[PDB]
Design an enzyme around this catalytic site. Structure first.
Site, PDB file in Angstrom:
ATOM      1  N   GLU A  61       0.839  -1.193   0.000  1.00 53.89           N
ATOM      2  CA  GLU A  61       0.000   0.000   0.000  1.00 53.89           C
ATOM      3  C   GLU A  61       0.876   1.245   0.000  1.00 53.89           C
ATOM      4  O   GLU A  61       0.597   2.243  -0.642  1.00 53.89           O
ATOM      5  CB  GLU A  61      -0.983  -0.021   1.202  1.00 53.89           C
ATOM      6  CG  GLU A  61      -1.985   1.158   1.150  1.00 53.89           C
ATOM      7  CD  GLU A  61      -2.729   1.452   2.418  1.00 53.89           C
ATOM      8  OE1 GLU A  61      -1.999   1.618   3.404  1.00 53.89           O
ATOM      9  OE2 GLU A  61      -3.985   1.606   2.438  1.00 53.89           O
ATOM     10  N   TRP A  83      -8.218  -2.054  -1.144  1.00 60.19           N
ATOM     11  CA  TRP A  83      -8.902  -0.928  -1.709  1.00 60.19           C
ATOM     12  C   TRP A  83      -9.868  -1.290  -2.865  1.00 60.19           C
ATOM     13  O   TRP A  83     -10.512  -0.422  -3.394  1.00 60.19           O
ATOM     14  CB  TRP A  83      -7.900   0.079  -2.225  1.00 60.19           C
ATOM     15  CG  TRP A  83      -7.203   0.899  -1.193  1.00 60.19           C
ATOM     16  CD1 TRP A  83      -6.080   0.581  -0.505  1.00 60.19           C
ATOM     17  CD2 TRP A  83      -7.544   2.228  -0.817  1.00 60.19           C
ATOM     18  NE1 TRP A  83      -5.743   1.624   0.396  1.00 60.19           N
ATOM     19  CE2 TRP A  83      -6.664   2.631   0.207  1.00 60.19           C
ATOM     20  CE3 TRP A  83      -8.611   3.092  -1.162  1.00 60.19           C
ATOM     21  CZ2 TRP A  83      -6.754   3.896   0.784  1.00 60.19           C
ATOM     22  CZ3 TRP A  83      -8.701   4.305  -0.568  1.00 60.19           C
ATOM     23  CH2 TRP A  83      -7.792   4.715   0.399  1.00 60.19           C
ATOM     24  N   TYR A 109      -4.863   9.354  -1.345  1.00 62.58           N
ATOM     25  CA  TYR A 109      -3.555   9.654  -0.820  1.00 62.58           C
ATOM     26  C   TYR A 109      -2.440   9.866  -1.819  1.00 62.58           C
ATOM     27  O   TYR A 109      -1.668  10.832  -1.771  1.00 62.58           O
ATOM     28  CB  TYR A 109      -3.114   8.507   0.064  1.00 62.58           C
ATOM     29  CG  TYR A 109      -3.963   8.369   1.323  1.00 62.58           C
ATOM     30  CD1 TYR A 109      -3.805   9.288   2.402  1.00 62.58           C
ATOM     31  CD2 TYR A 109      -4.842   7.350   1.457  1.00 62.58           C
ATOM     32  CE1 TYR A 109      -4.560   9.187   3.538  1.00 62.58           C
ATOM     33  CE2 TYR A 109      -5.606   7.219   2.624  1.00 62.58           C
ATOM     34  CZ  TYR A 109      -5.431   8.151   3.656  1.00 62.58           C
ATOM     35  OH  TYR A 109      -6.191   7.965   4.773  1.00 62.58           O
ATOM     36  N   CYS A 169      -8.854   8.581   6.248  1.00 64.04           N
ATOM     37  CA  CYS A 169      -8.799   8.466   7.735  1.00 64.04           C
ATOM     38  C   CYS A 169      -7.568   9.188   8.282  1.00 64.04           C
ATOM     39  O   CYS A 169      -7.584   9.630   9.456  1.00 64.04           O
ATOM     40  CB  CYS A 169      -8.799   7.028   8.234  1.00 64.04           C
ATOM     41  SG  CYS A 169     -10.383   6.293   7.951  1.00 64.04           S
ATOM     42  N   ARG A 189      -8.226  10.745  11.978  1.00 68.57           N
ATOM     43  CA  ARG A 189      -9.518  11.335  12.350  1.00 68.57           C
ATOM     44  C   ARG A 189     -10.484  10.276  12.884  1.00 68.57           C
ATOM     45  O   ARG A 189     -11.431  10.631  13.628  1.00 68.57           O
ATOM     46  CB  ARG A 189     -10.107  12.066  11.156  1.00 68.57           C
ATOM     47  CG  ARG A 189     -10.557  11.189  10.040  1.00 68.57           C
ATOM     48  CD  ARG A 189     -11.447  11.872   9.020  1.00 68.57           C
ATOM     49  NE  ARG A 189     -11.710  10.949   7.944  1.00 68.57           N
ATOM     50  CZ  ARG A 189     -12.566   9.934   8.002  1.00 68.57           C
ATOM     51  NH1 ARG A 189     -13.392   9.802   9.037  1.00 68.57           N
ATOM     52  NH2 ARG A 189     -12.663   9.066   6.995  1.00 68.57           N
ATOM     53  N   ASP A 192     -10.614   2.388  13.592  1.00 71.10           N
ATOM     54  CA  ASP A 192     -11.206   1.090  13.964  1.00 71.10           C
ATOM     55  C   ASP A 192     -10.157   0.356  14.722  1.00 71.10           C
ATOM     56  O   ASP A 192      -9.195  -0.163  14.156  1.00 71.10           O
ATOM     57  CB  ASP A 192     -11.595   0.406  12.648  1.00 71.10           C
ATOM     58  CG  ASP A 192     -12.190  -0.971  12.802  1.00 71.10           C
ATOM     59  OD1 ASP A 192     -12.038  -1.596  13.824  1.00 71.10           O
ATOM     60  OD2 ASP A 192     -12.883  -1.366  11.798  1.00 71.10           O
TER      61      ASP A 192
HETATM   62  O1  LIG Z   1      -9.054   2.545  11.074  1.00 69.15           O
HETATM   63  C1  LIG Z   1      -9.247   2.909   9.863  1.00 69.15           C
HETATM   64  N1  LIG Z   1      -8.123   3.053   9.078  1.00 69.15           N
HETATM   65  C2  LIG Z   1      -8.046   3.347   7.713  1.00 69.15           C
HETATM   66  N2  LIG Z   1      -6.890   3.411   7.089  1.00 69.15           N
HETATM   67  O2  LIG Z   1      -6.854   3.732   5.676  1.00 69.15           O
HETATM   68  C3  LIG Z   1      -9.303   3.553   7.051  1.00 69.15           C
HETATM   69  C4  LIG Z   1     -10.434   3.448   7.770  1.00 69.15           C
HETATM   70  N3  LIG Z   1     -10.450   3.169   9.157  1.00 69.15           N
HETATM   71  C5  LIG Z   1     -11.780   2.985   9.790  1.00 69.15           C
HETATM   72  C6  LIG Z   1     -12.272   4.135  10.616  1.00 69.15           C
HETATM   73  C7  LIG Z   1     -13.760   3.837  10.531  1.00 69.15           C
HETATM   74  O3  LIG Z   1     -14.130   2.628  11.196  1.00 69.15           O
HETATM   75  C8  LIG Z   1     -13.959   3.491   9.073  1.00 69.15           C
HETATM   76  C9  LIG Z   1     -14.038   4.707   8.190  1.00 69.15           C
HETATM   77  O4  LIG Z   1     -15.315   5.299   8.322  1.00 69.15           O
HETATM   78  P1  LIG Z   1     -15.461   6.874   8.492  1.00 69.15           P
HETATM   79  O5  LIG Z   1     -14.718   7.279   9.736  1.00 69.15           O
HETATM   80  O6  LIG Z   1     -16.981   6.881   8.737  1.00 69.15           O
HETATM   81  O7  LIG Z   1     -15.036   7.570   7.148  1.00 69.15           O
HETATM   82  O8  LIG Z   1     -12.802   2.712   8.795  1.00 69.15           O
END
Ligand SMILES: O=c1nc(NO)ccn1[C@H]1C[C@H](O)[C@@H](COP(=O)(O)O)O1
Ligand SMILES: O=c1nc(NO)ccn1[C@H]1C[C@H](O)[C@@H](COP(=O)(O)O)O1
Lengths: 283, 286
Positions: A61, A83, A109, A169, A189, A192
């Site tokens: 990635e 992705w 990105y 994110c 921001r 998970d």
């Molecule tokens: O932990 C995450 N890391 C990422 N790296 O690329 C992408 C996404 N996420 C997680 C955060 C949220 O659970 C979800 C994105 O949803 P959003 O915060 O509603 O855009 O995926």
């Protein structure tokens, strides 16, 4: 003492003190807003051991970002399919991007890092010389003015947001030099904790190893800062089992030759050494 | 446990554990990279009590951002001179902007918050309808989708950086809603802990009060995140004096009528109640 303990302590905190918070899908989370962890990068690499992290994923990635690609297929072709859903026909069509070829994630990105502010057309357009090459800027600054307090790479581009398959994110990162050592802080921001965060730490740790190598510095700290840190309600039971595992000593990351520019890194240049994760969560 | 103790513990940490790190200005610093504090906004307002913070300046500056001004003269006219040096002839000249009018800060906060991505011309130009109005977007989202994890206002604009008089220390902020409460996290890339940070905490806590008022929510937390957190070497003795003072309870912030839009707030609408700080400590500016 082991740096993974901070991650586990974050997870414990969200389980104990987080608030139930509905979310965009609708699966529900427990959530806390505002957390920070610091992972040393000095003679070890923070690839979490209480559950296996998809290292091949992290590395491919990151190489894909660096080449500035916004084509999901160019990643998928390396055996990393994280992705692919986001660039699918049905998914792009649902966002009104019916004119796009499948795979075209829009100005995510790779594009922001290499071409911030350029006008996005499609994933196959030539953007040579257009926008701000933030990544090369950071590298240049680290070499010439390491004390600078503006060493930022920002993926958050409000103008471009509506064209992205999804908003990033990882909103921005900042680099810092002291005592011959390069540190990185990520502003994430939304995290998970169960599925994304371990991967995201490995990613930004690896970027810092990459940049430190090309600028002749040693890796310092990775500072992980979170906005909405959350655990999906279906991950609670697996995380409670995970939380009972003692971390194994972190592995080492070796760079196998002298690389001069960030663009010249290849998958074969890297070796993870002594990674012993505990054995075997839905998204 | 008084919230100001977090700020004081940060300063103590840098003094004890910071590295000496030269800087752009030549005075030198003690510095730590990566800090975070949480200031409750729930029935108190985090205006520091161990020294006197320039509240008038906090309020006028924020109002000035909100109306989109990039003209230092327009803030100076309010008796708040904190941006004047940045817009002066000599400074604009030093940066190579000799064609620029005195006061014209370029595309700084007010422009980014209200017109992100628009083509900057000068401070007197008409930008109505141009670029992304991030401030209003954040308000709208809080109202229509409070669970959104993307509620961000970003002043950091790599394209515009070279036109700015100074790059923003406050790169971005994010808002968060739960349980009827509005929180804000600031990503501050560089913090002068002596002079800047207490003012900066008040700014964003005030911004959060303003938005919670408009969206009918209650202020939650202000989470302050720092990149290069530093103490200029000549602030060390003044800060050692400050660290001896015990905090007094924080004041309360009152909003004195119903305001419906963020553009309609005026200086008269706010009252700080019960602010009993220890005396100003003066610190030389870098
Ligand atoms: O932990 C995450 N890391 C990422 N790296 O690329 C992408 C996404 N996420 C997680 C955060 C949220 O659970 C979800 C994105 O949803 P959003 O915060 O509603 O855009 O995926
Ligand atoms: O703490 C600060 N807060 C500001 N709010 O608007 C503006 C500036 N600063 C401080 C951080 C640094 O000491 C200095 C800016 O220098 P730079 O980080 O070298 O760009 O002022």
């Amino acid at each position: 003492r082991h740096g993974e303990l901070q991650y586990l302590r974050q997870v414990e905190h969200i389980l104990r003190c987080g608030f139930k918070k509905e979310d965009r899908t609708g699966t529900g989370t427990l959530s806390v807003f505002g957390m920070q962890a610091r992972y040393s990068l000095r003679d070890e690499f923070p690839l979490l051991t209480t559950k296996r992290v998809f290292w091949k994923g992290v590395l491919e990635e990151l190489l894909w970002f660096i080449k500035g690609s916004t084509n999901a297929k160019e990643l998928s072709s390396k055996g990393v399919r994280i992705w692919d859903a986001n660039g699918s026909r049905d998914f792009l069509d649902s966002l009104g991007f019916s004119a796009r070829q499948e795979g075209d994630l829009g100005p995510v990105y790779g594009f922001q890092w290499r071409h911030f502010g350029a006008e996005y057309k499609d994933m196959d357009s030539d953007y040579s010389g257009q926008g701000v090459d933030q990544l090369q800027k950071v590298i240049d600054t680290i070499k010439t003015n390491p004390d600078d307090r503006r060493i930022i790479m920002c993926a958050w581009n409000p103008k471009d947001l509506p064209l992205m398959a999804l908003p990033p994110c990882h909103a921005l990162c900042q680099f810092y030099v002291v005592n011959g050592e390069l540190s990185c802080q990520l502003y994430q921001r939304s995290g998970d904790m169960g599925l994304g965060v371990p991967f995201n730490i490995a990613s930004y740790a690896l970027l810092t190893y990459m940049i430190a190598h090309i600028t002749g510095l040693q890796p310092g700290d990775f500072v992980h800062t979170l906005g909405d840190a959350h655990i999906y309600l279906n991950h609670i039971e697996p995380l409670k089992i995970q939380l009972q595992r003692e971390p194994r000593p972190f592995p080492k990351l070796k760079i196998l030759r002298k690389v001069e520019t960030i663009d010249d890194f290849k998958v074969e240049d890297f070796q993870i050494e002594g990674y012993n994760p505990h054995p075997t969560m839905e998204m």
